[PDB]
Structure formats: C-alpha cells, structure tokens
Design a protein around this nucleic acid. Structure first.
Lengths: 344, 35, 105, 443, 60, 148, 267, 93
RNA sequence: AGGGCAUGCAAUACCAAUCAGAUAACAACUGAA
RNA sequence: UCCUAUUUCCUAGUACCAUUAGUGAACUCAUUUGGUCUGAUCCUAAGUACGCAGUGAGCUAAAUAGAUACAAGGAACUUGACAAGCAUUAC
RNA sequence: AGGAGAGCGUCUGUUGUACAUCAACACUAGAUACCGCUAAUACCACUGUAGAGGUAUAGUAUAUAAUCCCUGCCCGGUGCAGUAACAUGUAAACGGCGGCUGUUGACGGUCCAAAGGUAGGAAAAUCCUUGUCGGGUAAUUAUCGUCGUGCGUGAAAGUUGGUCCGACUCUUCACAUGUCGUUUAU
RNA sequence: UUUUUUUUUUUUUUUUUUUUUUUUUUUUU
RNA sequence: UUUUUUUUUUUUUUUUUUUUUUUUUUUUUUUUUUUUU
RNA sequence: UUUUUUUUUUUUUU
C-alpha cells in the first residue's frame, strides 16, 4: 500500500516509541526512569510459563469463571418480527466475539491481485475472488514502553487464522494486537523488560526465563514478529548465551536469535482452527478457491503425465508440470551458508 | 489500439520519418517547392 | 369469446348513456376481485415519504438563511481577537515533542 | 467479489431508499436555476484596509473602506463610528463621487446615525452643480432607506436632475422620482415637470426590464398625472410577463388605489386594460412571512385582558390589518412605531396615510395607538387596560390622517432608552412565570 | 459484433490512427495521410495582380 | 419460493420517518390557537398537514386518498359500491394451487412420507376444475390418506 | 465522456416495478438498518443540549463503562431546560457544585482533610451514579413500539384519538357561511430502581384541525404543549420531544423532565 | 489512532468475573491546543513493520536466480526480449 | 504585389544529456539502432 | 400578561449543448408490413364508464402435415412400449 | 416422470466422448513431498512483481475419492535421501509378483527367485456373443438367485458392502390405446 | 429534467471543439 | 457468518484566512459604541 | 454522486 521508500528499511536506529510530556528532555529522562521503576515495583512473577501452567489456567478459566446466569428475555429488540427462519447463532451479549464492524480508522480496502503479476499473466494458479476483505493495521511493534493497556474486545481477522484484540492505553489511544488463548476482555498487558512473566507481556529473549512458551518473536532488533504468528503456534526456549538465545520453533527446528530482540509470552489464539470440516464445495467457493485439475487428465504437451496410463507402480518417477521432481527432492541452495540455524 | 497499448506509443509527427520520402500523386520522386 | 362479447354490449350501453348526457349511474352490486396485490396501499407510502422529504428540505433552507442573517444582525458581530498573543503560547524550539527532535521524523 | 445474502438485501433496499429520497427533494424547487448573475461593474481597483488607522485615511480611502465594509457585511459599531468621526473631520475635502459612495455604504448598512447625515447634507447642497447621476441617486436612495426627510435638499436634488436630464440615466431618474414621491417634497409644478420628463424618458429609453421599476402605488396617486397614469397602466399589461411578485403587488395596489380615489381616470381606461386588472386580483400573490411585534403583543395582551376578541395578523384582499375584532369585523386597530414616523418628528409617512385613507373610504373603523404614549404607562396592566377602554368608547379616526406634536432627537433617544429596559423586564417577568420549580432533591 | 461509437472513436479515430505502426504512405479518405498533391498550376493570360501562390510563409 | 430470506410478516410497513437531529422546531408551532387570541403563521396549514403524517400511525380516516394528488386515480373513484375481498383463483382448501403457464390446478398432499401432486386440467371449466380439486382433497382427508 | 453519463432523474439502471417486492425493501431499509455509532456518540452529539448530563457521565466513573456494553439498552437524556425549570435553585446549585468538585479532583490528579476528601468523593460518586443510572432501561423500546403498545393502533381504543374536530366557523368564517349568525403501559424497572415506569399517550392540539384541510370520512355519531405531532408520548409524565435515536447499543429519547428516584426525593 | 476528546470511550464487551480494576483514563493532552496538535502529529508518524531488501551496499548482500534443476514449462517456447518484440512494455527501457 | 485572408493538423527546438505531457528536485532507475 | 424565545426574508429573467416525452427488442444479424399475436409487472378491473389490431379469386381428385369421433380383441407391431393414450363427462 | 426383484454407483455442478453405442472432468475427506523470510514456487528486462504487506493449524506440488471398514508380501531395480568422504532408510512416490513331479490329495521330492496373489468379489465395463440347477411364461439361450471349475481380475493401485439414495442397464405387473391383422368418415 | 464543473478518474487527448485569443491601469459614471 | 461504503459537498462543533464574496432589487421591525439604563 | 453569495481549511456522525 505504502511507498517503497516508506516501507523498506534495513537498519533501525531505534527500538522504542518515545512520547515525552515534560517541557525539557532533562525532565523527560527523569520521568521515563520513574515510569520504569514504577513498572519494576509492580512486577512480581518470574517463573516460566509452561504448558502445564497454561493448561491449569485454561481449566480454571473455562470451568468456573464464566457464570452470570442472565435474564436474556429482556435483552432483545421488542416489536421486531425478524426474518422467516434466519436467526443468528447467539445474541451479541453472549457471543465469544464482537458482533459488529471493524474500526473505520484502523482498516483499509484490500487490493485483490487475482494471482497475477505486473505482466498480467497468471502466476499463482487456483486463485479466486471470494468475499470482500479489508486490510487491518496490526501493530507488530510494541513501541509503547513502560505503559499498561487493557483489552476491550476481541475481533475476527478474515486474513488470519487467529483472533485480534482491541487494546486501549491509559492515554486513550486505540490499537490492534495479536490476541492469545488466555487473554480475555478486561485483561491488562505491558511491554517492558522489567515486566513479569505473564501472558501478553512482551520481554526480551534474554530476560525471558528458560523453558518459556513464547510467540511473535522478531528477527532483527525492533522489526516485528515474523517467525511465528499463526494460530496454535508457539516457540520454546532451549538454551541461553551472553549474546544469543536458542529457540525451538513449531517445525521442530532449533535456531539462535539475538538477545536484544523482543518477544511475547503465550500462545496465539484460536488453537482449534484445524478441526473444521467443510460440508460442501460451497465453503471453498466462498473462501476464494478454484477447482484443481490433475495433470493425469491432460494431454502429453500440456502435462508429462498425459497420455501415459498407469497405476501406482514402481519404474518411472513422477515429474511436475515444470519438469522437476516432487518427491524427496530438496529445494534449497547448498551454497547458502547456514546462519543462526543449529539443527535443521 | 487498446488503452494499455496506446499508453506506450508516441506520435508519428514527433520524428523525422515524415521528411524521408518522396511519395506523391505524380509518383515516387517528389521535389519540394522552391528547391 | 362470450366474455369478450358481453363486455362490448356493456360498454356500448354505457357510452350511449354518456352521449345522451344522463346522470352517471352504474351497477351498484357485488363486484369481483381480479387483483391480488395491494398496489394502492403500497403506493401511498412513497408519496407520504416524499412529502416528508420535501418538508425537511424546506426547513433546512429556511434555517440556513436565518442562521446566516442572525450573525450579521447589529450588536452581535465583533472583530474577535485572541486575548493572549499566540506567540507566547507557541511551543519552544527545545520542546522534545517539537518536530525534528526525535529519531523518527 | 461476492456478498452475503443478508447484506445484499439491506444494501439494495438502502440504495433504493436513496433514489426515493433524491426524487423527493426537488419538489418545491421551481424557481431555481444553475446559472446566475453577479454585479461587478461597481468595485474599485485600488486596495484598502478597513482595519487601518482612520487618521492616515483620506477621502478616497475612507470612501472605499465604507463601501467595502458594506459589501462584506462587517457590521461593527466600533468600526463604523470611527468612520463617521473621520468623515466629519474630512467633510470639507470630499468629492461628489466619494460622497456618493459614502452615502451608498451607509444606506446599504442601514446605519441609523442622523448626526452624520445632518452634517453632510449642507456640503452636498453646495456641490449640487458638480454632482452626477450616480451621486444624486445614491443620496436620495440612502436618505429614503434611513427615513430622514429633507424637503429643503431633496427638492434641490430633483431640480438638478431635471437640469441634467440630458446626461442622467433612466434608472437613476426613475429612482429619484420614486424617492421624491415617497418623501413628499414636490410641489405641483415640480411634480408636473417630473411627470412630463418621466413620460418621455420611459417611452424613449426604457425596456421591459427598466419599465417595471417605475411602478409604485404611493407615487402613482400623488405625483403622476392622468396622461402618465393611463400610459403606465396600459404598458404594464404588455410588460407583465417580465415581472416579479414585488412588481405585481405594487401594480395591484396601484389599481385598487386608482379605482378608489380617481373613478374618472379608471373609467377612462379601455375594456381590455380593465380586464387585466380584473383578472389579476383573482390570482394568488406570494407574500413574505410576517409575525407580531413586541409592541403588538403587548397591546394584544392588554386588549385581551380588557375582554375583547380579536386576531393577531391577517390579510384582507390587498391590505394588512394589525387587529381585527371578531364580534364587530368593522373595527380595526393599528400599532405604530418609531419607523412609522420620520426621524426626530411624529409626522406620518405617505404610504401610511394612503393606506389609512383607502381603508377609511372602504369603511373600516380604524384606530391608532402610538408608542411614545404607550411607553409612559410602564409595566402596569391596569393603566393599559383603562387606556384602551377610554379609547374604545370614543369615535374612530377621520378619513384624513393628521400628524402628531413636535419632537426632538433628545426626546427620541430618551424614549428609546426607556423602552429598552421595559422590553427586557417584561420578557424576564414573562419567562420566570413558566418555571414551576417543584422538585426538591435530598442529596 | 456490437456497434459502439465510443470504442470506434477511441480506437480507430484520427488521433488513434497516428499511433499505429502502419504504412501511412497509402492515401486515406478519412485519415491524415502523408502524400503530397502538387498544388495549383502555372499561370496563362489572367491578371498578374490576382494570382495567389503562398500563405503561411507570407502571413504578417 | 418460501425461503428463509423473507419477511416473517405480510402486513403493510409504515416505518417512522425521523427528522434531522440538528434542525429547530417548525414555523407552524408558533401559532396561538386560543379562542381569544388567533394567530395563523404563513404556510401554517401546509406545514401542519405534512407534519401530521410523520408518526405513521395517524394516517387519517382516508389515508389512500389524502396524499394522491394526481387526477388519474380520482377519475376512477366511485361511491356506494360493494366489492369482494378474495381473488377468484384462491381456494380455501389447503394444498390447492394454480399454475399460469400450465393453466391447471394442482393438489399437494403427503402420503407415507413422500410428496405427490396430481394434475387437474382447467380447459373444460375454471369452477369445475377448482371444485374437482377441492373434492379430491376432501376425499383424501376423509379416506385417511394424508399424514398427520 | 463515456458510454453513458446520465444520472439523477435519468438513472440508466433499471429497477423493479412490483409493489409486492418494493414493500419488502422498505422494511429492510428502516427496521433492519445497521448503525455504526454507539449510544455515547449520540449522547455527545447533543452535548450542547444536555451539558449537565454530558458532564456527569464523563465525570463520575462507572457510568461510562456501564453505558458501553453490547447488550440492548434504552436511555433517557433530559434537557438542560427541563432540569433548570424543574429543579429548585438550591438542588441545582448543589448538584453543580458536586459535579465541579469531581471535575476538580480529576484535574488535580492529572495535573484530617485527606481522610475527609475520600469520604466526600465516595459518597458523591455513589449519589451521582444512582441518579444517573436511573434513566437506563434494559431492552430496546422504539417510539412506534411504545405507541402501539399503548393501544394507539387498536380500533377499539382509537375512538378518542381518531375523530377530532373544532369550531370551524371561528377559524374560517369565509369558507363556512352557513354557520355564521389511553391505557397505561408498564415498562421494566430501571437498572438502579425496582419501581416500574408507566407510559401513556395523549392527543395533540394540532390533531383537531386536520379535517379543515384534509379529506375526512368520519361516520355518524350518536397549558398545551407546542411540540409537533398528532400524538404525544408521556413516559412517566415526562413529554418526549425527540426520539428514535437508534444506535449500536440501543435507543435514546429526550424528555422534558428529569426523572429522580424516591431514594433522592425528599419527604 | 486517537479518538475525539469529547468521547474517548469506545464500545467494549462485558468483563469477566475476576477482572475488576477498570481504572480511569489520563487525558493530559486537553490542557492546550498546541499540545494536542503536536501529540496527534507525533502519533501520525508511527510505522507497522520494516521490510528488508537486497542492497549491494551492505557487506552481506545477495540476489536470487532460477530454481534448482532448471527445467521449464511443458511444450512452450519462450522468446526473449529484443528491440523488435515486446518493445517498450511497462517502462521505456 | 494596392487591400483582405475564421477554424484544424496537439509545436519554448533559428536550439541542446536520455527517459511521460502543457518536456520530469537527487536517489530508486534499467538501454545494441 | 403561564409559548420550548414574542430572534423581518416570496422569486435576480438566467451562458453553451442534448430532447419528437405514447405502444412496440428500438441492439448484432437479416427474407425488416417497425406498431397486431407469442411472457412476467405497471390501475382495488362484472377485461378498465365503445382502447389497439385484422393481407386477390375459384374448386368435394389423390397423396402428405394436423384436429375430433371409432364395433370386438388389447402389445399379436417394433431391436426396443418409439409413438399414441390416461389426468373432462348424473349436478 | 407409476408398483416390485436384482446388477452398478457422490451427487448438486461443467461438457458431447481415451474402442465393441452405453463417457469424462470437478468435489465434501484422508494421506505424501518441498520450504524458517530477501521462504518455496511462478513470470523470465532481473537489487522487479505475484506469492504477501502472509509467517509451519502458513504457502506450493503430485496421486487417490464418502462421513467408518480391520488397509496383504517384496528395496535384486531407475531416482531421490544419507555417506565407509557410494553401510542404511523411503512400495498412501516411483514396473510389479512362477515350473516339473507323486499320494479329491492336509502330506513328501527337486529347480529358480528380492517376493513368489493375501482376502474379497467372481459367467464379470473383464472370459465367452446358449456353463449346471431353481423362480416367471403355452416357449426364456434374454434376466435374478446360487454353485466356485472354464478362462481369469485383484486391496488408500482402491477391493467388498449394512442402511439411505437415482434422468443408470435390464426383468416383470397395472390403466387406456389405430403400434397392429387392416384399414374408414368429417 | 440532462449535459458542463469538484470527486471517483485517466494528456486510458473522440481532428476542425471549450469558463482557454498575451496573463488587469480595468477610465469605476 | 463467507466479516461489507465514505472524498467533493451538506449539517454540527472549534477559529486571528480571504472582496476569488450575496442585486447601488425589495420588505418589515421600539433601536446599536464611547461621557442617556 | 455535490442543490441556490464564491474560495482555503480541522474533528465526529443516520
């Protein structure tokens, strides 16, 4: 959306967003130190957030916490006959998610490419135009240091497999963040090295205890989470160094990361996304998918597989449309030197 | 000509190509007035 | 065929009466109902709405003119000026929030 | 892309609604037009600053400033009074052109300040020979608007106009005539000469557009002779198409007054001409919105307390009545004011006298109530009721309206000031009674 | 095969043809060709004072 | 088709027409209607007549005719005439239907959890075919071949 | 400069002509219409009109959080004028003083006296919260809904609301020369009150002049508020001047009287 | 995003049982007009993320080529660019 | 050639790096004629 | 003096260009009577209190394309139940 | 376009075809392979764009076809993966899987091989244009049931199939009927 | 009632066309 | 739930922008600074 | 899809 000069950057000369209030920078420095000490005083928890602890907290949250027993009879629009069969799943006052519209000032229109490059030719096959979508302004950088923020509601992201959260700071500014499995409307978060080891809290890798479940880990200092963002994904702390932190990713891969980078504590929301079963091809049609035609039912010129008839068999290895093997054939530059990768 | 195709072409009068021939009603050998 | 025949005679009779210039009298009896849709009732609401809209627009123009004139009336209009000079209230150059004083620009 | 069935329905209905709404807006819009005209052949080329030092200003500067203020509708007392003060100082170095501009500005602004008019009049009187059409027109036009009669000067203005007829503009000539007729300063001979010149002017250098401006009921019946009356009446019929309600009203009024006052001249008209006017009356003529005045309301309250039924406002064919009794429709009251009389005097205006006589002729029991007499009563209701009762038992006013006693600026000012506080105290007392004040909170 | 004057004028008009990599030497009825047409002939026995010959080179 | 995506009610809708939330009171409100003091502002009736039809409930005794200014409809108006309130092609018996293109009546009834429809040609006579279909449905219900 | 440029009146698009289908779009465009703005938005929009309320809402905590919930709600916003003319001078001054005290406390924060201040703020906040919350009513109640509920649409109950006439000889003598010479509906109790709210309807003064300028078909028989409309809705003996302020959270109605609970009412 | 000062509050869902708290806001930008304007302008500068790219300037730069193994399309003859084929396509040169 | 001579052919080239248009702030930014 | 405040406001003669207001696919195409008929809407209609539209003459041959009515038998016809038939008959 | 038996079988949806007149494609589902960000892959002006302003519950590629059902053996073999710096692991990736002879014959001899058709179905979208017996008819080789030899197929190559389902072949029942022997009238 | 003009939206120039002729000392009357 | 519109302009709010600005058309009304409330 | 004195410019919204 934005210009290349406005979006492209290699080197970063800052890792925080400063919003001073005093007339002079000398006073602002003292104010920042006071805020940091205030957050340090409040911080109390330092134990690692393990899977077992996560489980135990989830059991408490989803066993007894939710009890209101409300009078839903009065919570409805009186005198509205409604549709002739069409009814919502649940009322807005009992739904998990917010029954509304995304913020106008935190969203924009989505440019649909249809899987086409500048040349105008089809690049990405099987790409349809489904339901209209809006790009969300997700705040990946926690620039707001030494400040608390409470959660107002949880939103749905069509573009992501996880849920979002509407964060509001004390000053009254609204921002979007990646929600968690634990976080519920009303919970408070803070981004600071002196903060406690709690869900939602963002702390450096180095400060984060060992054997701690984390997510939204950034590659470079102050760049944003790229290695793990999807729902149900998380990383683990293995080892620690004076300048490096060893992390186990979701793909069972061991890699070292800088000690200076930031990371979030917890698990991405919507853990049960891989349990839905589509009852008909209409779901795929609405999602923006297209039918896939196998190469077997193609002409020899169209596809190598064409013409040649045969079942599983063992003589002639299969060939893709591109003339390249697709079974156990590694696709990686052997010359590319391994970096911070420990175990691949 | 389509819009996309037309957006990447110059005018013929922008070049000297129009003063490199002698085609006329008389024939293929045209002499300019006052030559 | 029979209905299209009877209609003609009826019409003829009626026309004869009209030509004659006799008082307008019809068959005041139980008529059938060949229609199904409530076209008249559905149509009245559109005119009602339209009328409402018109009224609203009239009101808006009236208000606009009145408002524009009121301010121009004598004794109200004044060359208002700031009490404290804006220069004093202007922020200083060393203010941390002043543009070009943080590594973001 | 694709939309949800649910959303689709709502969007289509919304869209439809939009169309309906748009269809429903341009109903009353009949007289509108995308195209419009703006007058631009009057602004000065030179640039000035209204907010500048008046001392550094000159005649030219001040003249410009005055008109620019007027055009921009920058109504500021503090600003205008400085202009007046500097003008008084620079009164002896004003060109005829500048004076005219000044006058026009003042008049357009409706800046009621006699102190300046009275001081600038004598210098105009001396510079009359060097005056021009525009200046001459603006002087009178301003004077008329501000309602400051000057029979000594206005007459001179007219005479200079007649002298410079060969150089004057039809429009300015017409406006001068109109002004003169409204102010009532033209002897018979002057009137006659004006009429004679006006007829030739209208018949030689006037069009449909320019002719309409010559129509005035007050002028027609007090300035215009029979020969011009007949020609005016006849040409109006022909030029009616290119007219406005404002001219229509005037025309109708003219007709009515002529019929009522001059039967002979009326009969002298042709059948065709007569028919026009006959049919005219039958048509609905638009009118501006009207409402009772504070004085009107006070009088009405006193009257109602006295125990008499009446109306607030209503039209009667071609004339408005302040008060109309229901038990005896014949009866009618009229509430006057400062504007009803000339500045610093209690003399009635020509239009007020003409409307009084027309109704008196037609048989309307007409009564008049002044404001300077009324103000004296204060905020007492019994005194006003008795005042009204004493008037009721007395006979009505004569056909011919007369003027009141002498007055002065001092007195005028005093009266105004006095009334200022009465109108506020009565409003406060009225407004306070509406408040129940019953609820009491524990807290 | 539809009739579209908009399309026709936007793709096949005087200003659209000039952008075409075609043989402009061919004569065109409704086009701006680039073929020279030899002008007015020599003079016989008429008045010498009324023989026109130039304009854009002589305009003043 | 009787699809969910349809209003539950079949009554004429008269939604509220709210005014803008920033306009002042109308001009007609400044009228003194007292027997002693009478005051009729400009366009008082014009404004009030329109204003009265805002609520949507107070449509008046004659609603279909208090807003149709067009003479087209007035020209056709009649007084003291009896009219029916039922379309000719609407049988009171449940399950009866008529088809315009086929020009025939149909009877819908359920038997043994299976839908079955029968043909009734109306070429011989509209009333005869309608009565035959009604009699067939009544015979079905009497003999007890319709599920319940 | 395209295929077609006609707009407005001359809409190239084709729309349905059937009255049956047209009758369904009006319902969706009026009743099932969606709103983005919240209740607070609506309230704020009229801050000028209700400054007292606007300030109390933002001053006393708790009310702001309560009035932002997803559940349907109904709110009443009394006018400054109503408050002023109803409330006694002493009560009005005392209320304003406490509102200003809370605002000053918040301004001091952002910028045995210490012990007494805590008790004073604790008591004043509860009093104002109680006062404020009294107006709030669960559920969405529309003007039409209330009107109909009140028996406005029942022919058996519309006898006193349909036939209205006045002396025409006194108001239009020229056009008449021959003459010369409801029930109570109970609403759910408020959030901070147990007592129900009675609502009724009344006939306006204007309604008694329709026949003079409209076609009527009546059968054979055998102070006054200046607000417009044929019918006036009285919610607990407070007149409604404006209503139908639909929002994402519910509806807002402006009443001409401040509702005060018995707990605050004097002896 | 900074909402309007006349109504900083926004819609939210019901808080769970053990949430409580709900502290008030700290509106320190309503004391002066210039302070509010400067605060809004400063907030307007915030970014989302920083994207890397190939740069020869850097000591650890690199670029991409073709996929391993080469190959190509099935029965397709690709004609390379020239001055007489696909000339002047997206830009002049 | 005494006098007159609408309009259109997209024109700062009787000069001046290249690349859209009434001929483009650096850089991004590339070239067989 | 008990109105939610008793806050003056009809309408300036008006640049250039488009238009046949009704029925009818009026568009590509062409074996083109423009307009009747062939299908849903637009009018609370005993088909709208007389609306639109309708093109040489003669004659029992047979065959062919269709409509209505057929004794008894009722698939014996055909590769095949193709086709045809039933769905209206005391009122 | 009806009642009943039985063979085959995910349609709705797209389209006139890989032989003997009787098809395909797509899909709800499962499973395999590649890829840690300037990702893989594609276009093939190369510091570009799509992928994607996405981040291992993500992207892309190949093959199969129901929500379930128990789902056989084989790495001698091309290729890929790995490295004694050419063991070993991948058959839901990549062709497939048998001779003499003796007692209806559990059993015994001998040759060869990585392994030596599993179960089920079975006169078949396959052998043969009349396999034995039973049901229908005055006649049934057409067709259903069954036997399992006559030739033979063959398991995430998709086999078998309870219930439900049908614009899919065929048997058979019922009403009317100029299809008819065999042709008439308007 | 449209077209024209701002926005969508584009020198993605509809030859002989335009609020477009050298761009305010305009003689204000 | 397959997660949907906002810029020109209108209204409101906040102001130290400007003849690139509303007839030298017209009506009504008790009325307005500083040394008359 | 902007409606009546012309421009520049800021927030919210049925």
């Amino acid at each position: 959306m934005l210009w290349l000069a406005a979006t492209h950057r290699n080197r970063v000369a800052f890792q925080l967003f400063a919003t001073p209030r005093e007339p002079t920078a000398s006073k602002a420095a003292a104010a920042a130190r006071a805020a940091a000490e205030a957050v340090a005083r409040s911080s109390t928890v330092s134990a690692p957030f393990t899977v077992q602890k996560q489980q135990r907290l989830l059991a408490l949250l989803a066993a007894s916490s939710s009890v209101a027993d409300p009078s839903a009879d009065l919570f409805r629009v009186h005198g509205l006959p409604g549709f002739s069969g069409f009814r919502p799943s649940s009322p807005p006052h009992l739904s998990k998610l917010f029954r509304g519209r995304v913020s106008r000032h935190l969203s924009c229109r989505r440019v649909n490419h249809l899987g086409r490059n500048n040349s105008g030719r089809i690049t990405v096959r099987f790409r349809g135009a489904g339901h209209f979508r809006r790009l969300r302004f997700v705040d990946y950088k926690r620039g707001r240091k030494d400040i608390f923020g409470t959660v107002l509601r949880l939103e749905y992201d069509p573009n992501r497999s996880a849920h979002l959260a509407l964060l509001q700071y004390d000053d009254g500014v609204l921002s979007y963040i990646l929600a968690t499995e634990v976080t519920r409307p009303g919970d408070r978060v803070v981004a600071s090295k002196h903060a406690s080891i709690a869900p939602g809290n963002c702390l450096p890798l180095g400060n984060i205890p060992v054997s701690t479940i984390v997510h939204n880990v950034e590659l470079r200092p102050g760049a944003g989470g790229q290695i793990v963002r999807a729902g149900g994904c998380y990383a683990t702390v293995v080892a620690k160094d004076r300048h490096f932190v060893t992390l186990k990713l979701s793909s069972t891969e061991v890699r070292r990361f800088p000690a200076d980078c930031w990371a979030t504590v917890g698990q991405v929301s919507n853990a049960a996304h891989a349990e839905r079963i589509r009852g008909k091809a209409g779901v795929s049609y609405w999602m923006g998918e297209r039918p896939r035609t196998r190469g077997k039912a193609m002409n020899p010129v169209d596809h190598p597989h064409g013409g040649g008839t045969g079942k599983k068999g063992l003589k002639r290895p299969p060939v893709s449309k591109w003339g390249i093997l697709c079974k156990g054939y590694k696709t990686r530059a052997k010359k590319k030197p391994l970096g911070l990768i420990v175990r691949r | 000509i389509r819009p996309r195709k037309k957006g990447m072409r110059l005018d013929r009068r922008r070049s000297k190509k129009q003063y490199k021939h002698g085609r006329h009603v008389g024939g293929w050998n045209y002499r300019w007035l006052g030559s | 065929k029979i209905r299209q025949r009877i209609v003609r005679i009826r019409k003829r009779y009626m026309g004869q009466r009209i030509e004659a210039g006799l008082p307008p009298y019809v068959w005041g009896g139980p008529y059938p109902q060949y229609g199904r849709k409530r076209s008249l009732f559905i149509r009245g609401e559109m005119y009602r709405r339209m009328l409402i809209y018109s009224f609203d627009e009239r009101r808006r123009r009236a208000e606009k003119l009145r408002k524009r004139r009121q301010a121009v009336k004598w004794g109200v209009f004044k060359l208002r000026q700031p009490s404290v000079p804006p220069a004093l209230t202007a922020l200083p150059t060393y203010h941390p929030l002043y543009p070009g004083n943080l590594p973001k620009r | 892309g694709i939309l949800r069935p649910r959303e689709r329905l709502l969007l289509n209905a919304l869209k439809k609604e939009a169309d309906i709404r748009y269809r429903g807006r341009r109903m009353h819009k009949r007289f509108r037009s995308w195209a419009q005209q703006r007058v631009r052949h009057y602004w000065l080329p030179q640039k000035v600053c209204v907010t500048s030092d008046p001392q550094l200003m000159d005649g030219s500067y001040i003249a410009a400033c005055v008109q620019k203020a007027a055009t921009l509708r920058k109504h500021d007392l503090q600003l205008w009074h400085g202009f007046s003060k500097r003008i008084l100082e620079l009164a002896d170095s004003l060109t005829p052109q500048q004076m005219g501009y000044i006058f026009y500005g003042y008049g357009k602004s409706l800046f009621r300040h006699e102190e300046l008019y009275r001081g600038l009049l004598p210098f105009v009187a001396e510079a009359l020979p060097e005056f021009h059409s525009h200046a001459l027109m603006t002087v009178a036009w301003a004077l008329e608007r501000v309602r400051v009669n000057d029979r000594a000067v206005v007459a001179q203005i007219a005479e200079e106009a007649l002298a410079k007829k060969d150089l004057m503009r039809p429009a300015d000539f017409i406006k001068i005539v109109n002004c003169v007729a409204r102010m009532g300063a033209a002897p018979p001979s002057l009137a006659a000469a004006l009429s004679a010149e006006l007829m030739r002017v209208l018949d030689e250098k006037c069009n449909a557009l320019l002719f309409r401006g010559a129509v005035d009921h007050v002028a027609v019946a007090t300035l215009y002779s029979d020969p011009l009356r007949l020609y005016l009446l006849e040409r109006f019929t022909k030029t009616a198409i290119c007219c406005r309600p404002m001219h229509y009203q005037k025309a109708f009024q003219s007709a009515v007054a002529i019929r009522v006052l001059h039967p002979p001249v009326w009969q002298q008209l042709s059948k065709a001409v007569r028919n026009f006017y006959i049919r005219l009356s039958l048509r609905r003529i638009p009118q501006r919105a009207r409402r009772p005045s504070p004085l009107h309301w006070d009088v009405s309250n006193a009257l109602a307390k006295l125990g008499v039924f009446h109306r607030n406002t209503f039209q009667w064919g071609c004339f408005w009545i302040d008060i109309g009794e229901i038990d005896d429709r014949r009866q009618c009251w009229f509430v006057d004011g400062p504007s009803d009389f000339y500045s610093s005097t209690n003399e009635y205006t020509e239009a007020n006298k003409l409307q009084h006589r027309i109704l008196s002729e037609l048989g309307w029991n007409i009564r008049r109530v002044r404001w300077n007499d009324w103000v004296q009563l204060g905020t007492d209701m019994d005194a006003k009721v008795e005042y009204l009762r004493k008037l009721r038992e007395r006979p009505p006013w004569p056909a011919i309206l007369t003027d009141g006693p002498s007055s002065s600026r001092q007195e005028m000012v005093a009266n105004l000031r006095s009334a200022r506080d009465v109108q506020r105290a009565l409003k406060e007392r009225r407004e306070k009674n509406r408040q129940p004040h019953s609820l009491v909170m524990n807290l | 095969n539809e009739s579209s004057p908009l399309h026709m004028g936007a793709g096949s008009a005087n200003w659209t043809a000039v952008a075409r990599l075609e043989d402009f030497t061919l004569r065109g009825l409704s086009h701006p060709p680039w073929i020279h047409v030899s002008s007015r002939p020599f003079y016989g026995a008429g008045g010498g004072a009324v023989l026109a010959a130039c304009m854009s080179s002589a305009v003043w | 088709s009787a699809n969910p995506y349809k209003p539950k009610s079949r009554e004429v809708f008269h939604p509220y027409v709210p005014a803008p939330e920033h306009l002042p009171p109308p001009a007609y409100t400044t009228a003194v209607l007292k027997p002693m003091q009478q005051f009729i502002p400009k366009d008082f009736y014009r404004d009030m007549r329109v204003d009265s039809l805002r609520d949507g409930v107070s449509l008046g005794s004659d609603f279909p005719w208090n807003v149709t200014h067009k003479y087209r409809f007035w020209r056709r108006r009649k007084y003291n005439i009896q009219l029916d309130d039922r379309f000719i092609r609407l049988s009171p018996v449940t399950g009866v239907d008529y088809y315009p293109r086929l020009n025939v009546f149909a009877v819908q009834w359920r038997e043994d959890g299976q839908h079955r429809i029968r043909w009734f040609r109306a070429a011989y006579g509209l009333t005869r075919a309608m009565r035959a279909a009604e009699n067939f449905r009544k015979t079905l219900e009497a003999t007890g071949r319709v599920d319940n | 400069r395209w295929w077609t440029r006609a707009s407005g009146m001359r809409n190239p698009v084709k729309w349905t002509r059937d009255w049956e289908v047209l009758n369904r779009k009006v319902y969706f465009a009026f009743d099932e219409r969606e709103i983005r703005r919240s209740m607070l938005d609506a309230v704020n929009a009229h801050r000028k009109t209700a400054s007292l309320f606007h300030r109390m809402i933002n001053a006393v905590p708790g009310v702001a959080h309560a009035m932002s919930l997803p559940g349907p709600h109904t709110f009443f916003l009394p006018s400054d004028k109503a408050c002023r003319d109803h409330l006694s001078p002493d009560s009005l001054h005392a209320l304003t003083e406490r509102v200003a005290f809370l605002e000053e406390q918040q301004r001091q924060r952002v910028g045995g006296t210490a012990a007494a201040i805590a008790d004073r703020v604790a008591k004043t906040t509860e009093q104002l919260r109680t006062f404020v919350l009294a107006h709030l009513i669960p559920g969405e109640w529309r003007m039409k809904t209330l009107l109909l509920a009140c028996g406005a649409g029942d022919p058996r109950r519309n006898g006193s609301l349909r036939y209205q006439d006045t002396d025409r000889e006194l108001f239009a003598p020229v056009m008449y020369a021959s003459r010369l010479g409801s029930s109570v509906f109970l609403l759910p109790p408020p959030q901070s009150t147990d007592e129900p709210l009675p609502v009724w309807v009344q006939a306006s003064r204007y309604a008694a002049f329709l026949p003079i300028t409209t076609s009527t078909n009546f059968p054979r028989f055998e102070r006054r508020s200046t607000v417009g409309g044929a019918l006036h809705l009285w919610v607990g003996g407070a007149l409604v001047t404006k209503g139908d302020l639909r929002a994402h959270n519910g509806v807002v109605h402006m009443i001409d009287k401040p509702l005060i609970p018995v707990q605050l009412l004097a002896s | 995003y900074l909402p309007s000062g006349h109504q900083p509050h926004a819609e939210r869902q019901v808080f769970h049982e053990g949430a409580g708290e709900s502290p008030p806001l700290n509106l320190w930008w309503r004391e002066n007009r210039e302070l509010e304007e400067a605060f809004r302008r400063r907030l307007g500068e915030a970014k989302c993320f920083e994207r890397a790219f190939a740069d020869s300037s850097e000591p650890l730069g690199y670029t991409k080529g073709r996929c391993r193994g080469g190959g190509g399309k099935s029965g397709r003859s690709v004609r390379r660019r020239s001055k007489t084929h696909k000339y002047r396509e997206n830009r002049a040169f």
